[PDB]
Amino acid sequence: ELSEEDKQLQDELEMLVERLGEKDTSLYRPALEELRRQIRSSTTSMTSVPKPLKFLRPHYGKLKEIYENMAPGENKRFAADIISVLAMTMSGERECLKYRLVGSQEELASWGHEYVRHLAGEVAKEWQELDDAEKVQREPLLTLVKEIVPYNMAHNAEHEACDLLMEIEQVDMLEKDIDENAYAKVCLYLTSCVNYVPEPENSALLRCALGVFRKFSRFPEALRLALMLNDMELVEDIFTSCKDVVVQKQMAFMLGRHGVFLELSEDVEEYEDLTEIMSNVQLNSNFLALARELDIMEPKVPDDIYKTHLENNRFGGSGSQVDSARMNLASSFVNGFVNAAFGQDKLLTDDGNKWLYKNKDHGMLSAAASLGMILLWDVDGGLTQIDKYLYSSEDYIKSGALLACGIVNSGVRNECDPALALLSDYVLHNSNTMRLGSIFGLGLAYAGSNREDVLTLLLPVMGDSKSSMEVAGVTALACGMIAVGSCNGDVTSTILQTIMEKSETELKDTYARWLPLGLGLNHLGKGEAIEAILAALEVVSEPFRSFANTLVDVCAYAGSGNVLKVQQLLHICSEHFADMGAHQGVAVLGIALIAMGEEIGAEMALRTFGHLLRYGEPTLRRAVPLALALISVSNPRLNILDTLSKFSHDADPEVSYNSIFAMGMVGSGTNNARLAAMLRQLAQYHAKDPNNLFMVRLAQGLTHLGKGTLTLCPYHSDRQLMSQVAVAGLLTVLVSFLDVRNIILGKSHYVLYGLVAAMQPRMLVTFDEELRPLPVSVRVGQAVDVVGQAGKPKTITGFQTHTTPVLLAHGERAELATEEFLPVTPILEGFVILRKNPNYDL
Amino acid sequence: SKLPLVTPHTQCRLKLLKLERIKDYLLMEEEFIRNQKQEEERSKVDDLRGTPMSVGTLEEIIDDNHAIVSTSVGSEHYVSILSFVDKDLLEPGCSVLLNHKVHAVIGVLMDDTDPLVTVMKVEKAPQETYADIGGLDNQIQEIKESVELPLTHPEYYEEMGIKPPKGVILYGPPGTGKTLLAKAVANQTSATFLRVVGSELIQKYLGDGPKLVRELFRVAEEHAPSIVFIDEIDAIGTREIQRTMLELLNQLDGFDSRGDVKVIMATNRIETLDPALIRPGRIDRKIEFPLPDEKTKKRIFQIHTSRMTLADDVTLDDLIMAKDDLSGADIKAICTEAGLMALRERRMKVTNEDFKKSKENVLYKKQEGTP
């Protein structure tokens, strides 16, 4: 039974359909008028159970013929409207939209907000159900969208219309009807959504949000998103369109951090400041400030990092009195990594020549170059210090010094281009070591420059068959990192012809594996652009064929999250059958490169790699730890470190070596205490193996890199923006490590220095508009959305109050503690500028 | 292992996109696993341990490869130890696999005894985070400095030469979020979490109290980086019960070196705490949990009503206003009951009046007494 009022409404709804059983017009205007008013009252009300709709399970089902054949006047409109409003409850999704289309067009707000939302969803569905072969039935759907979207923007339904409009793919028309306050929600929503929607819709969504940002005059964020679109011409356009000098300086800081530099003309006001900031050369002057503002200025000793003074030195007394090569190389690498960028050392400054005299062979090419990391971005600092070795009697240390000269200039650009000048006359040096050091240093000094003078100085070395093969490999690597992702034909065609000519005995040699990377680096993040290139690559022979093609395809989709390409890479990883399988090994880092763009992608790749390790043959097994390292570079997640620990003791020596590297790589510069503990335990555990000792100590140097202020994260700007030069900087080392016995533990330790291409510190430094340092109290902590659902994600949770400057580990965010200042850019990462708030009043 | 956390909660296609991303990845897992030696080592060892193998207990180790083992029949056997058994993994009380015929020790079995503390090891912290708590910033920094920073970055204290603080008491009116904050810090640093509720350590058996606390600290130090939570410490805090206090105080301050395990103790009646248990040497960090103020109350309302569908007319300020009359738990109660009240009148979209009558009814049920 039903209550008295409920019974009255039920009886009304009943004899409102009992009467309709015939032709009389006294039903279609009057009775449908009563139905319309009652249904309007029900639906307009917030009551989530419209009472007529509860009763109307015995629906209009008898009234189909008269509904169809009646005159299309107000009677048909009324019937269609009533059946449409009711139809959201029955399974009439295909037909509710048609009922609304054939009924009175009306305004959707008249019925109810939930009705508007359901009709919007139905429009979104019918857009995809409609074929792409015609464009006439889409106009009726647009005649609903044109009013649904403004209604949603009026009613705090930003994400609804965003999704509606990406479903019909026509994002173009969100860039007109936005309010000055509602823009934040929508831009942030598509900014979050872009990482998941596939190509090319993600790029169109990006440029749509960029248009919205330009229309709301948010120039720094517009340039940030343009850098997402990695098209320097678009960045140049927005930079020219800017109207604030200080905003231009802030975005020049962002460009210098991203590693992008573009020429400036005389019309660019305050030319010197913008040019030098975008050239990043000021960084050292800032960096040595931060270091001395927290007084870490004392350079640490590799022995002290090992802290042999406290462990029980069970190798000592008689059996320690030798300056053996391997641990000396490890100590030199540790001194370089830990004391990197601090511009000073106590070991290899006072005993510079003396320490070198007690190393041997490839250590000289390494140890000397180590100094270059300590003297980072003080070009006139290192460049005054390498001279004593630029004319050294020793030749191998000369090779190391000639690379240190270039590595000092890494990350900064000088109008003079000093490294270009110094290393130009030695890129054809007769001795292989001199040429190798010169070319590696020059490539590091100009990674991401794309300038064609250096590229045309580099390219002839490809055809220079007289140069040893590793020289060709380093040349391809340098050409790749100098021109990252640009897909420039001048480089690309030349390197394609270079890789096209090698024979069987050359395709299988240790260093040829880098040449495809030199191609792939030129195609970073460009995707289907490799498809035209891939047609040529199939001409070369298997297994080197699949090796090169998979590597370049991976480079084409690095950070894209393209799950279809990841599926193809998994198929490559799934061919169960060892040199011919080396192409599978690269494929492992593939799932890293694609999935390292999203948190969910990374954390799911973590679970994939566990099973892949459980089932993998040794070629995949050794490759996995490198990809694990790249997932969380300078982000020591415990669920990664524990796996690396459990696989650091594997009987397979190469699996152990790669896990040991991944230790320092995931915790690079983080100075984590627990990881340092397991590294010390491994050092006292693997003391019987010089290889494992060297690897463990190298990892110890990696985690203590820059004493805690330095990291190798290729992403920046709230971990949404990636730096292609940094991506290459890791990628070369990680792909090289696939044969660690020959490449790194063998002849080519210097290859590790490639990570200096990714060298970027993590901190906040606040300046006033004069750009002098301005210590400001800020609120620092993790990032979550909490009460932000498809809206504002600003939440520095579990925060502390810290006066700037402060270091910012992976996942850390900072916010202005007091609103007394206004930041130039509301993304507080790296060097930021502040202004006094005039709207704020006392 | 667990799934990622999808962090839109409103029904939007962003939530969808994250989901089908996850489906893609798990489907690649399925693909990979479906698309599918050491017989010398097995033929030596796993044939020396000829099936079946019995399970017994190790009592003593006498020689390098000779040990005493008891079995479930209670008999005692001096047997040999095969070389592959990890000696450092063997100690009195350890469960050991034995050859059926000759009872020789053929390996250590990972422990499956001490059931109760094994249950209270919980480790099921991930339901909350520092995100779920709003406005307790002073408390957050205090506990971070005391327990969280020494676990995440003991480097600062070791470099400073500082032995980190080794005890924290949380206090305040109930429902202020002490338990929530403890669970949240357990979530932030993934160190093993141990919870034991107050009176539950009080036991009828004379030994069971001190014995229970001893075994709980034993398991905590066994897990090494660990946090132990004693809520309503007042039940014990305010001879036998005093002896359990003495056991806990000595486990905190006394002999041996405790190491890494941290201790959080939550009380509602801190002023009734005995002077001994509040040790200045151990308990140097006392964190008060005051009744939330206007800003904190607003934060809690947003946090709890965030997951609820809300109407436009809701004016949160009139709910926030008046005085600090109530805590966060009461706020959750208002949110829940407003949800039910909207449900009765058939709203899936709660309105302002719902919260108004909800707070009124809660204040009615809040306290009592004749005028």
Binding site: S3, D6, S48, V49, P50, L53, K54, R57, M88, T89, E114, R117, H118, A120, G121, E122, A124, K125, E160 | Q11, C12, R13, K15, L16, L19, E20, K23, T309, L343, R344, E345, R346, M348, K349
Partner: peptide, 28 residues
């Protein structure tokens, strides 16, 4: 107020959904 009749919960959990409900619970 009358208790929630089965139709009432049905309409409560049907009318109030977004146009996404079915997809995302099925996906879960």
């Amino acid at each position: 107020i009358r208790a929630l009749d089965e139709g009432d919960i049905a309409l409560l959990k049907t009318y109030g959904q977004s146009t996404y409900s079915r997809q995302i619970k099925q996906v879960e």
